Amino acid sequence: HMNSVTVSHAPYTITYHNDWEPVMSQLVEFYNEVASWLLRDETSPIPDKFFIQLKQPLRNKRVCVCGIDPYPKDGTGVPFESPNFTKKSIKEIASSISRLTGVIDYKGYNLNIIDGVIPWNYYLSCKLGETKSHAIYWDKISKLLLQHITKHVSVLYCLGKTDFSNIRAKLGGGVTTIVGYHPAARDRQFEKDRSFEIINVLLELDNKAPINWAQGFIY
Amino acid sequence: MNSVTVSHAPYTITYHNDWEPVMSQLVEFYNEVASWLLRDETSPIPDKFFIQLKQPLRNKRVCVCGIDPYPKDGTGVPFESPNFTKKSIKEIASSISRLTGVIDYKGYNLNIIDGVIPWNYYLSCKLGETKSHAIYWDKISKLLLQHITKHVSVLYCLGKTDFSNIRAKLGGGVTTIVGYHPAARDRQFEKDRSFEIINVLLELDNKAPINWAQGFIY
């Protein structure tokens, strides 16, 4: 179910799943407006990995786990992913799921291999080593894409109370938005955060299947 | 424990200390719209508009919210029913009855429950007309709800259609659930699990549960 459109600058070709179709024209238009600017910065991730998450189906997703932007370094295009399992954020998320599920022995963790879950970066790049530095470039695109995502998922789970302090939640909507502590914050706080369990309670209340968070583990 | 003056009726607003950081803008916003708002007969009466501001907020962990007051005989206390005839509070009491096991009762009040603040998003309607003062309360409503959600752990909105266009900067801290309106005649509120799930959500947020049985009047 894959398609392809072209943008005037790198990565030139953008692959996407059918479910993203209603957005892709405005996306191409918007990205052509800012690409020349942001590409003059070296970025995390690299341009070829900006949009790889658009390959994912959305209709089978019921939970979005969203961070504000990619890792300052070594981003892969897949939000929170750390191939060698070294980034603090994914390690803490893993520790939380470890205590939750009883899985003690694991090599890594990836939110992208969990049924029903799509991990998301609100901004799709940052200047290398500088968090939120590409906000002005992704702004319009960021609203466009997230709004489309929340047309499919039942729960939007944002990580970072400061980062998402001004997010406007739509009540009725059929989408519940919760904002938790950033996993790489301070004074634990994220560790005692039970947002993953809360999500499943919300899902089951909405008569949806719950998330099997243990699926994220890599052995 | 406090008081401020406004230019139109009810001319004065009494409030608890916890509402202090909001009262500056509230007076300003109310003076802007009160003139048009007051040309209609309202439910509730102007002197009952803000009586829920007398409630403490620091000791509240659950907000139960309707879109606006009942079009007749509103008391300023959301969902309150003196003679216990409004279908809303009766369906609610019925649900709480099943949850708590309390069988015999002659009434129910959400406003006498520790940790719970009943709320109406819009603070008035024209007498006999539902959702008619949305355009006057809009700014005020966002301000007051945002403040509440700085304190409560769970926000329970009743009426999916009613709240379908409402957006809010929740922040927190706050888990939101939106359920069917209790007075809906196409729905069976007995099948609603919202009240039961609230205490689960509170436990997951490491808070004490709500004792819903405190609502019963005997």
UniProtKB/Swiss-Prot annotation, chain B:
EC numbers: 3.2.2.27
The reaction(s) this protein catalyses: Hydrolyzes single-stranded DNA or mismatched double-stranded DNA and polynucleotides, releasing free uracil
Family: Belongs to the uracil-DNA glycosylase (UDG) superfamily. UNG family.
Protein name (database record): Uracil-DNA glycosylase
Subunit structure: Homodimer. Interacts with protein OPG148. Component of the Uracil-DNA glycosylase(UDG)-OPG148-polymerase complex; OPG148 and UDG form a heterodimeric processivity factor that associates with OPG71 to form the processive polymerase holoenzyme.
Hydrolase found in the keyword field: yes
Keywords recorded for this protein, A-Z: DNA damage, DNA repair, DNA-binding, Hydrolase
Group of enzyme by EC: hydrolase
Gene Ontology molecular function terms on file: DNA binding; uracil DNA N-glycosylase activity
SUPFAM superfamilies: Uracil-DNA glycosylase-like (SSF52141)
Active site as annotated: D68 (proton acceptor)
Gene Ontology BP terms: DNA repair
Disulfide pairings: none
